């Protein structure tokens, strides 16, 4: 009998690996003629059709809490954002001593005391003459020097004005593994993020993942199938957030009704500052709307699943955040270029014991923006003319459990902004990268000639 | 009768020049912190590099035509400049200063070496100014004609070195890429040129610390058996005479002042660290070196210089000839502060066939490192008392005089060129490219 | 009975687009001229071109669909910016000026063309300012309302051209990567399109000077035999006609003004070069060209324009149909001075079937190259008088009007696009991709 080693090259065997996946965007998007911070133009074009191959009899182990595709997406998103603001105007000369007064013309009772009317001396295009100008600033952007104000960022760092020729609207981008690697896609409907995946497939690029930046509420994301899924790294912990994914989307309208005007202030050769002119009409508050019927059931679906982890006879509560800075204690996003900070204390409320209404969520606005929890890298968002309104649907939540001990009768979950990579971890939970290892050796009855 | 047989993989090499890449000990310095010649971005070095000794192969080395030196120079400079790119630029500091002498408990030796200046500067808000003051060393300021200005304002605006990045010389290992090799010379008495009977090949060079100094090689590799005199042409006066010690010489250097640092806000997120005030007595910096230890070391140097200049020659050491401070003094770095010590107490003797020598040392904060023009750097002050205990392992000498008649050779320290500082570490290395194709006759023939 | 057999390395190619790299001789590099067309970036060129003539081959070219022109355009612009990256930005020059006419010796022709302006200015020290003056041409100052300002201040600040660098064109060869080839058409009567019976292949193109000009192609390559007329759609009035003379017409350019350079320090390590005062009399800068050699050349151009428009047509010339200064005039560069000569005296004739003609020329220093906006450059004034002589080796013409089918054709000068200056040099070359695999039938089957 006997056997001799036989060498096979090209065998289907792979091992987990980490590498650099390259982007892939739709070709037609380039014809929009306007660039976006995500640099879809510099990103590779996508293939005309998707190529996916189903793999029978194969079981693989996934882990969404140690996936490295998220850590690369986090760096790419930060890197793209910075590169877009490198060539834009730097608002150092705006760190001067302002003189402000309240606006009261057609001021709504709720909104009184939020918008300031500030005036300051500024240089003109000529380096000798100076001009007296004014601009409206929200109260969250200015502080008093201890009637006399200053921008909040001056004692921390200067900000680069956002170029009005670049957009913030998400543009779907696919992550493609280069040659010698592959991406495995868990096709299971009830996958909970870790463990075996009975169904798997290989694809050349991931689906279109929109880099939506949001807090406490995952918008415009992907919806689950046949149920609501609760996904936590260690469900019986308290410092690990919970990534609920909604089965059925819930719509949330939001608006900034003010009919404000833009105004260009030239502060140097070829560089201009886009200030805010006087408003047109009444001064009101920004807000989003949520149908109370769909939100009342959508928490009805969520509570039932949570009963499968913490108890079948526990009293599930909800509460209004934990407290802290607006960037974590509110639902933040940008709608049209204006950055909202909505107080969602009314969505999470009431306790669970075992048709034409709405829930209005007041929202603040801001212009001096720190995006990625970084210190000294602010940005200034220019104002947008005309009322801006956006309609989107929520598709998840980022909750946190307070961890009560010896009184397990009730578990209270509060929304949590967590880290920004949890926002994208909810879209890459199906994917993992594997490195192909073509060389293999097995025994057979063959031998070499001569 | 015989046919051409081609072999692929033969051990043949030829001298070549390519690009080597860095590699640091990595795990040896865990909890790493940022610094120039970035420890990160260097491929981590293997825990046990494999050195292979080649049996009876003789290679002709040359340390003065070496290209690893030229690439290291352009490489150390590049790492230096790319670290100053993000730090503060002190344009606002090029203003009119009003300085008065420092006399608060000052010693006669340091009577007027540091001034006390007040100047106007803007604050975070551009429309308001602040009046600030700082202590400046007299070497950094020039009178305008009580009104002084920083010495660099009419040449360039200096960048303030970031305080979070250190100047500590972390060791570096230069590695040759695939298809190349690095030949080490194992001979104890190899004078830097000519055949080296003992040869070996390594993946990367040993740990080389880029210690920038002058006329004294600090923290260097020692000669294994004897003091070695190395020069390109010993009979040439215009060639610096490198010297290597077989025994280190401790040099204790310190700054005995208790300086305080003060932060002045000159813009959004920008601070210029002024020298707040000196707490206590004001005394000059200095280095110490044992008189008996050094006088022994110079004895060996003469014992070997005689081999090249004869038995009977009288050999006198003398202090540097002259020039600018950057070249005529033992300039170096100690803890981030830049010293310039007057070495006239070391090189002072005439040689015929417990007590510590103290060298007065000066300080500066406007530094021009690589002899360039217009790229000054401002080293922020360091709070406390500075001290370094490095030990000496070489010299950079020069000679002069003599034309058709001589009986007593005089040597002086010198050398401001920095590639002479790393030429002392890479004298036992060279890079070659492997050539695997070889054709030799054999009796075999192809079948068809 | 036949089977498939594969051949590797067959001579087959197909049209393609790739990145071509520049290669120049080291004459400018060895002496450190530092031309803006960086030869430091470009690789060393081969000692002598190697051209292979491909007999029996027919190839179809198209000079208008050639992509080498669109890749050279981006190369030239990019090399331009990289040279201006370190040069000082003239942001402090945007102040209110106070100008008065110069009349010391100004001749009536140039009366009012330059002004004597004075202004506050910065200094090395941040707390002081200086009062200085400089002569600015009339085209580079707009009355602000005896108070003017630089014309660019409301759009962008200009970087002053590093005086050390040079604008003089130097040949740059475009070389094909591995697996690609360049095919040169050698047919003399080749009209820039269609099959070219005779072809060769070269590794790199001939030296092409990136000469920037308008309405007249200078220092170019001359045709052979007869004058060649080339247009994309010669029956379209929207397409420019790229003439190419077979003999070079010589043009002499100069500015007699003996202006002086003056350096003003506007900050730490930075300087601004003012225009000083002019020694002697101030007069106009002109360009000469023989009226006899220019008359015969149009006689040779007209008999070729006849073949494409008829023998009985009255061929008439006119001057540019108005517009901007940069397009209505023959704008070029020589000696660092940007001329904008008025060519209305060259194109004025009617053809129905020693002496010189002088062209007044203006000068300006705020320059917006490549038809870009907001990226101006300031050209420093040059010492002394400037003179230069050059070929005239082609034109850029345009028709106008459609009143009649064919009665009278008037051809005006053009130059609205900068690529046409380079389409007249690369019209001979096309880049191809080599596909070495090839399968054909043969009587051969694998044994065993």
């Amino acid at each position: 009998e006997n056997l001799w080693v036989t060498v096979y090259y090209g065998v289907p065997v792979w091992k987990d690996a980490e590498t650099t996946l390259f982007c892939a965007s739709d070709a037609k998007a380039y014809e929009t003629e306007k660039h976006n911070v995500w640099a879809t133009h510099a990103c590779v074009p996508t293939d005309p059709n998707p190529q996916e191959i189903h793999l029978e009899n194969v079981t693989e182990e996934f882990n969404m809490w140690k996936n490295n595709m998220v850590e690369q997406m986090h760096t790419d998103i930060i890197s793209l954002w910075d590169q877009s603001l490198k060539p834009c105007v730097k608002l150092t000369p705006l760190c001067v001593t302002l003189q402000c007064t309240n606006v009261t013309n057609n001021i709504t009772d709720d909104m009184r005391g939020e918008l300031k009317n500030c005036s300051f001396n500024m240089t003109t295009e000529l380096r000798d003459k100076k001009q007296k100008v004014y601009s409206l600033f929200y109260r969250l952007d200015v502080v008093q020097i201890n009637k006399e104000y200053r921008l909040i960022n001056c004692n921390t760092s200067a900000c680069t004005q956002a170029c009005p020729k670049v957009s913030f609207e998400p543009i779907p981008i696919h992550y493609c593994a280069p040659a010698g690697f592959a991406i495995l896609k868990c096709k299971d409907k009830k996958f909970n993020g870790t463990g075996p995946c009975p169904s798997v497939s290989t694809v050349q690029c991931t689906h279109g993942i929109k880099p939506v930046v949001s807090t406490q509420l995952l918008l415009n994301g992907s919806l689950a199938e046949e149920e609501v899924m609760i996904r936590s790294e260690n469900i019986t912990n308290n410092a690990k957030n919970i990534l609920v994914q909604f089965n059925t989307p819930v719509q949330i309208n939001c608006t900034r009704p003010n009919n404000n005007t833009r105004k260009s202030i030239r502060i140097g050769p070829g560089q201009a500052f886009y200030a805010t002119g006087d408003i047109i009409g009444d001064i009101r508050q920004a807000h989003c709307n949520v149908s109370k019927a769909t939100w009342n059931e959508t928490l009805g679906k969520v509570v039932k699943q949570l009963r499968k982890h913490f108890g079948n006879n526990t009293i599930i509560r909800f509460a209004n955040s934990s407290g802290g800075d607006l960037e974590v204690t509110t639902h933040s996003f940008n709608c049209g270029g204006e950055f909202f900070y909505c107080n969602t204390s009314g969505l999470f409320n009431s306790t669970w014991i075992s048709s034409n209404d709405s829930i209005t969520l007041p929202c603040r606005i801001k212009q001096i923006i720190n995006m990625w929890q970084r210190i000294g890298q602010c940005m200034y968002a220019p104002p947008i003319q005309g009322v801006i309104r956006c309609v989107s649907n929520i598709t998840g939540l980022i909750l946190t459990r307070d961890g009560g001990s010896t009184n397990s009768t009730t578990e209270t979950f509060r929304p949590g902004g967590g880290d920004m990579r949890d926002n994208w971890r909810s879209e890459l939970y199906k994917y993992k990268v594997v490195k192909i290892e073509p060389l293999g050796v097995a025994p057979t009855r063959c031998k070499r000639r001569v | 009768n015989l046919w051409v047989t081609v072999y692929y993989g033969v051990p043949v090499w030829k001298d070549a020049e390519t690009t080597l890449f860095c590699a640091s000990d990595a795990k040896a310095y865990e909890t790493e912190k940022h610094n120039v010649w970035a420890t990160h971005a260097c491929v981590p070095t293997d825990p046990n590099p494999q050195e292979i000794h080649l049996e009876n192969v003789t290679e002709e080395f040359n340390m003065w035509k070496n290209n690893m030196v030229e690439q290291m120079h352009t490489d150390i400079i590049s790492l230096w400049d790319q670290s100053l790119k993000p730090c503060v630029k002190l344009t606002p500091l090029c203003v009119t200063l009003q300085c008065t002498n420092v006399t608060n408990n000052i010693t006669d030796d340091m009577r007027g070496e540091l001034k006390n200046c007040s100047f106007n500067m803007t604050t975070e808000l551009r429309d308001k100014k602040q009046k600030v003051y700082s202590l400046f060393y007299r070497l950094d300021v020039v009178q305008i004609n009580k009104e002084y200005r920083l010495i660099n304002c009419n040449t360039s605006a200096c960048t303030q070195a970031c305080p979070k990045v250190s100047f500590e010389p972390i060791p570096i290992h230069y590695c040759a890429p695939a298809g190349f090799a690095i030949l080490k010379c194992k001979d104890k008495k190899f004078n830097g040129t000519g055949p080296c009977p003992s040869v070996s090949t390594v993946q990367c060079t040993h740990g080389i610390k880029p210690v920038v100094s002058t006329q004294l090689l600090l923290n260097g590799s020692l000669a294994e058996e004897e003091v070695m005199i190395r020069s390109e042409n010993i009979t040439n006066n215009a060639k610096n005479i490198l010297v290597q010690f077989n025994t280190p010489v401790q040099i204790n250097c310190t700054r005995p002042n208790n300086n305080t640092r003060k932060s002045i806000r000159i813009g959004p997120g920008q601070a210029f660290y002024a020298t707040g005030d000196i707490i206590g007595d004001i005394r000059q910096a200095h280095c110490n070196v044992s008189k008996a230890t050094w006088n022994e070391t110079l004895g060996k140097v003469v014992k070997q210089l005689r081999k090249h200049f004869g038995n009977n020659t009288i050999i006198r050491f003398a202090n540097s000839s002259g020039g600018d401070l950057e070249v005529t003094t033992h300039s170096f770095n100690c803890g981030g502060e830049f010293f310039y010590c007057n070495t006239s107490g070391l090189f002072n003797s005439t040689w015929i066939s417990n007590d510590s020598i103290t060298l007065p040392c000066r300080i500066k904060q406007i530094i021009n490192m690589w002899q360039r023009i217009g790229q000054c750097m401002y080293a922020p002050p360091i709070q406390g008392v500075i001290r370094c205990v490095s030990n000496i392992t070489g010299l950079i000498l020069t000679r002069d005089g003599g034309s058709t008649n001589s009986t007593t050779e005089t040597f002086r320290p010198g050398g401001g060129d920095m590639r002479d500082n790393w030429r002392s570490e890479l004298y036992k290395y060279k890079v070659v490219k492997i050539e695997p194709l070889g054709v030799a006759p054999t009796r075999c023939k192809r079948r068809v | 009975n036949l089977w498939v057999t594969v051949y590797y390395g067959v001579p087959v190619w197909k049209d393609a687009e790739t990145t071509l790299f520049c290669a120049s001789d080291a004459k400018a590099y060895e002496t450190e001229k530092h031309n803006v067309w960086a030869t430091h970036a470009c690789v060393p060129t081969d000692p002598n071109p190697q051209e292979i003539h491909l007999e029996n081959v027919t190839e179809e070219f198209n000079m208008w669909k050639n992509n080498m022109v669109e890749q050279m355009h981006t190369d030239i612009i990019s090399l331009w910016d990289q040279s201006l990256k370190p040069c000082v930005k003239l942001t402090p020059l945007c102040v209110t000026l106070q100008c008065t006419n110069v009349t010391n010796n100004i001749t009536d022709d140039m009366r009012g063309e330059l002004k004597n302006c004075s202004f506050n200015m910065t200094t090395e020290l941040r707390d002081k300012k200086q009062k200085v003056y400089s002569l600015f041409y009339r085209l580079d100052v707009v009355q602000i309302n005896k108070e003017y300002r630089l014309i660019n201040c409301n759009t962008s600040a200009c970087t002053q051209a590093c005086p050390k660098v040079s604008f003089e064109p130097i040949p740059i060869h475009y070389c094909a990567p591995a697996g690609f080839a360049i095919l040169k058409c050698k047919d003399k009567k080749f009209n820039g399109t269609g099959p070219c019976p005779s072809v060769s292949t070269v590794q790199c193109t001939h030296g092409i000077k990136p000469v920037v000009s308008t309405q007249l192609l200078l220092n170019g390559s001359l045709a052979e035999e007869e004058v060649m007329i080339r247009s994309e759609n010669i029956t379209n009035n929207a397409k420019n006609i790229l003439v190419q003379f077979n003999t070079p017409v010589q043009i002499n350019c100069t500015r007699p003004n003996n202006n002086t350079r003056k350096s003003i320090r506007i900050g730490p390590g930075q300087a601004f070069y003012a225009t000083g005062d002019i020694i002697g009399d101030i007069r106009q800068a002109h360009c000469n060209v023989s009226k006899a050699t220019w008359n015969e050349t149009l006689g040779k151009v007209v008999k070729q324009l006849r073949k494409h428009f008829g023998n009985n047509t009255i061929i008439r010339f006119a001057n540019s149909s108005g517009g901007d200064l940069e397009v209505t005039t023959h704008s070029f560069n020589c000696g660092g001075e940007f001329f904008y000569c008025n060519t209305s005296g060259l194109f004025n004739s009617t053809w129905i079937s020693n002496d010189s003609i002088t062209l007044p020329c203006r000068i300006k220093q705020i320059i917006n190259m490549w038809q870009r906006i907001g990226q101006c450059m300031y050209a420093p004034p040059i010492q002394g008088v400037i003179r230069c002589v050059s070929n005239i080796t082609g034109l850029i013409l345009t028709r106008d009007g459609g009143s009649t089918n064919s009665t009278t054709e008037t051809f005006r000068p053009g130059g609205g696009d900068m690529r046409d200056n380079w389409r007249s040099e690369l019209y001979k070359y096309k880049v191809v991709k080599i596909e070495p695999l090839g399968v054909a039938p043969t009587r051969c089957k694998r044994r065993v």
Epitope: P93, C95, V96 | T91, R126 | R126, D127, K128, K129
Partner: antibody, heavy 140, light 111 residues
């Protein structure tokens, strides 16, 4: 021509205050400055104070610091000087007049980003036009 | 800051000449050296008239017979071709140092 008008004379008891009123032709106070001087029988001229024509500056001598304040109406059509703390020695004749000043740059400090810092110093050139002259007396 | 004048009295006859002096507290080397000095002449029942400003310029309508000079802490004024109307008191006012002040006064009378 620029000309000034003032109010009539008054008499007050010690410790009271007098607020004089002054007017000018053509609203010259919008283009030139205003200064105040008084003089008594056998006594020399005594500079009191002034106000800039832009309104940026209003200076008075230490002799009348706190005891005097100056204000003017809209359009610079009328200007008032108020003296409080009247005493017997204050009996004199007060004059309304206009003077010219030199505005010079005293200290400069450049800025890349923002308006360059500057400090301006006023200097008294001349007194141009005097007013009618108002007599104020303090008596029991 | 203080100012003084001399002589205190000047008995003059028509056709004669007279000279006056003025003092400045500080040798302030600024504003063209001679800096800002103002002279005035007053008579009883009449508002004073400006005579010299900037220490060297003749006021509008003033005959050329009046001139002044000085610098630093001292200043001087001169008169010539005296006539009857020249009687009165002359004041020198310092316009540089804030607060500004008049002078003691120098009287001129017929002789």
């Amino acid at each position: 021509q620029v000309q000034l008008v003032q109010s009539g004379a008054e008499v007050k008891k010690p410790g009271s205050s007098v607020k004089v009123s002054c007017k000018a032709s053509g609203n010259s106070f919008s283009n030139h400055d205003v200064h105040w001087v008084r003089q008594a029988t056998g006594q020399g001229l005594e500079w009191m104070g002034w106000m800039s024509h832009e309104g940026d500056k209003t200076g008075l001598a230490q002799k009348f610091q706190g005891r005097v304040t100056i204000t003017r109406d809209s359009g610079a059509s009328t200007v008032y000087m108020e003296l409080r703390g009247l005493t017997a020695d204050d009996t004199a004749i007060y004059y309304c007049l206009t003077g010219s000043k030199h505005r010079l740059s005293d200290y400069f400090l450049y800025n890349e980003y923002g308006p360059n810092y500057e400090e301006w110093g006023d200097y008294l050139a001349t007194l141009d036009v005097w007013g009618h002259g108002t007599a104020v007396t303090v008596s029991s | 800051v203080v100012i003084t004048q001399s002589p205190l009295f000047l008995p003059v006859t028509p056709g004669e000449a007279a000279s006056l002096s003025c003092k400045c507290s500080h040798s302030l080397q600024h504003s063209t050296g001679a800096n800002y000095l103002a002279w005035y002449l007053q008579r009883p029942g009449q508002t004073p008239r400006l005579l010299i400003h900037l220490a060297t310029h003749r006021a509008s309508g003033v005959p050329d017979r009046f001139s002044g000079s000085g610098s630093g802490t001292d200043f001087t004024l001169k008169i010539s071709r005296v006539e009857s109307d020249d009687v009165g008191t002359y004041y020198c006012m310092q316009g540089l140092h804030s607060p500004w002040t008049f002078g003691q006064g120098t009287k001129v009378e017929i002789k």
